[PDB]
Write a protein that binds this ligand. Structure first.
Ligand SMILES: CC(C)c1cc(C(=O)N2CC[C@@H](NC(=O)C3CC3)C2)[nH]n1
Ligand SMILES: [Mn+2]
Length: 295
């Protein structure tokens, strides 16, 4: 049985008037987006912030991820540059599918990803950078710090409300984190600390595939997760269990849990609503930035 893609989550293409600030816009789309857990926001075509990270000195040690670690029930983290990681990432994907990386359909990577997660005869290992502080490496967005030069054409993005460094983070301190992905690199089902909102921007690269569950089904997902989780992980606290909450979306959908999907492309935002469980994986070499915010 092949993977059945969940229905698509809402995609909003606001005009320049509606693109005023995220909090006011997110508040207006809330009646629909909170019923799907996640949503995608495409900025106007003329809104193109330049990549402001120091690519030359961007050196990181990615995490190692075995796709079928739960099904099977040694591996250690090589330092890459942003360019050397991309060469490895593209070589892996083109070799795996035996075709140019830009020719692999997104539905094929999705179908192959979920086959490998539950496959016991093929062990696929990938690498990714995650939770990289924008303070130590610089943000993908231009920032008024004096650390790097801001051109006059870039000041509008350093002051934009959609710049993740300008999101309100103080609940009635925190900085955005960076994520460098490759094909099959994934993140497990989780919600944010304090049931916070989260906003995610894909600066460049191949798409990031998301799955989302509305907050009204959070208890149902947790019950399905605990009923099907291994016996040794079923009783673990949520903060620790979320580190290994891998589950095919079709399994949740079979148990009545509503699940929505989307492919986040370069230059697009993804917002997850409070207590909306979400998971996903990367289609290929990409660079993302994320922050939890409060309304
Ligand atoms: C604000 C911080 C705490 C955060 C990050 C996320 C999240 O869910 N993200 C980030 C991008 C994507 N993760 C990946 O692509 C991983 C494989 C490399 C999903 N939520 N809050
Ligand atoms: Mn998240």
């Amino acid at each position: 049985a092949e993977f059945v893609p969940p229905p698509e989550c809402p995609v909003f293409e606001p005009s320049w008037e509606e693109f005023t600030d995220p909090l006011s816009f997110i508040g207006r789309i809330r009646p629909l987006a909170e019923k799907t857990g996640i949503c995608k926001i495409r900025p106007p075509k003329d809104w193109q912030p330049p990549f402001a990270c120091e690519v030359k000195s961007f050196r990181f040690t990615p995490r190692v991820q075995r796709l079928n670690e739960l099904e099977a029930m040694f591996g250690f983290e090589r330092e890459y540059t942003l360019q050397s990681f991309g060469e490895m990432a593209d070589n892996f994907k083109s070799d795996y599918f035996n075709m140019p990386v830009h020719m692999v359909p997104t539905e094929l990577v999705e179908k192959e990803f979920w086959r490998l997660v539950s496959s016991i005869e093929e062990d696929v290992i990938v690498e990714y950078g995650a939770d990289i502080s924008s303070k130590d490496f610089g943000s993908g967005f231009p920032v008024k710090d004096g650390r790097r030069k801001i051109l006059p054409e870039e000041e509008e993005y350093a002051l934009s409300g959609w710049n993740l460094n300008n999101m309100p983070v103080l609940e009635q301190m925190k900085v955005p984190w960076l994520y460098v992905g490759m094909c099959f690199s994934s993140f497990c089902w989780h919600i944010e600390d304090h049931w916070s909102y989260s906003i995610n921007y894909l600066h460049w690269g191949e798409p990031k595939t998301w799955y989302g569950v509305p907050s009204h089904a959070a208890e149902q997902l947790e019950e399905v997760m605990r009923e099907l989780a291994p016996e040794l992980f079923e009783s673990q606290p949520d903060l620790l269990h979320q580190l290994v909450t891998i589950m095919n979306p079709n399994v949740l959908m079979e148990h009545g849990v509503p699940v929505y999907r989307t492919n986040q492309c370069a230059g697009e935002f993804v917002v997850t609503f409070p207590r909306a469980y979400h998971s996903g994986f990367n289609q290929g070499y990409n660079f993302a930035e994320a922050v939890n915010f409060c309304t």
